[PDB]
Amino acid sequence: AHQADSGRTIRGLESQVEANRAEISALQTRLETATGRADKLEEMNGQISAR
Amino acid sequence: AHQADSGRTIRGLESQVEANRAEISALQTRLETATGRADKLEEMNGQISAR
Amino acid sequence: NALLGEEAATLKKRVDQAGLDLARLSRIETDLEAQLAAERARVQAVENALA
Amino acid sequence: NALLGEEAATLKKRVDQAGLDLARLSRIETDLEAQLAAERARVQAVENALA
Numbered sequence: 001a002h003q004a005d006s007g008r009t010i011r012g013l014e015s016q017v018e019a020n021r022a023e024i025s026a027l028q029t030r031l032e033t034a035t036g037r038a039d040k041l042e043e044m045n046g047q048i049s050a051r
Numbered sequence: 052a053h054q055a056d057s058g059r060t061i062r063g064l065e066s067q068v069e070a071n072r073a074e075i076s077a078l079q080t081r082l083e084t085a086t087g088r089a090d091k092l093e094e095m096n097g098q099i100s101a102r
Numbered sequence: 103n104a105l106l107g108e109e110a111a112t113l114k115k116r117v118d119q120a121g122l123d124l125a126r127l128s129r130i131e132t133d134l135e136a137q138l139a140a141e142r143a144r145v146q147a148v149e150n151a152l153a
Numbered sequence: 154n155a156l157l158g159e160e161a162a163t164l165k166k167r168v169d170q171a172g173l174d175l176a177r178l179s180r181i182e183t184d185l186e187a188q189l190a191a192e193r194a195r196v197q198a199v200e201n202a203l204a
Contacts, residue, residue: 014132033164
């Protein structure tokens with residue numbers, strides 16, 4: 001019985017952890033997108049200021 | 052042994068959960084910061100383009 | 103612009119799905135870690151006990 | 154054009170990285186599956202010797 005309860009909680013808790021890890025990598029994708037965007041907009045904004 | 056083992060497993064996985072919660076919170080926080088930098092810089096991009 | 107937009111949308115969907123798959127692989131490999139430890143304890147303690 | 158081009162470039166880079174991570178998960182599942190085969194044989198054989 002205790003092992004059955006352990007199994008229940010183990011896979012449920014694992015499910016929430018992989019949801020969390022997915023959000024990790026995914027929000028981290030959007031983060032890299034945003035940071036590269038900001039950088040290169042800085043870049044040509046400077047260049048076109050020189051223009 | 053099973054009691055101790057399952058208890059420590061629940062410990063490890065729960066720790067992963069709150070740590071991952073902190074990490075995700077960090078993801079949205081710096082994500083909004085970066086996207087705000089990008090948005091303001093994009094506004095200035097529009098201005099200098101018009102000029 | 104249309105070409106780049108289609109490519110960006112497709113690759114964003116791809117990287118999201120990749121994040122999901124990587125997450126669930128991480129979950130299942132952690133499960134395998136756990137099962138390995140558990141039944142290793144099983145068979146080795148059984149060597150000792152039967153001997 | 155510059156916007157979407159650089160975004161797609163970094164995103165393609167990460168799709169390659171994701172493929173690599175997928176690969177190492179595949180390798181680790183192969184390793185764990187081989188080990189669980191070996192230990193399964195061990196536990197079944199030791200039970201037979203028991204009987």
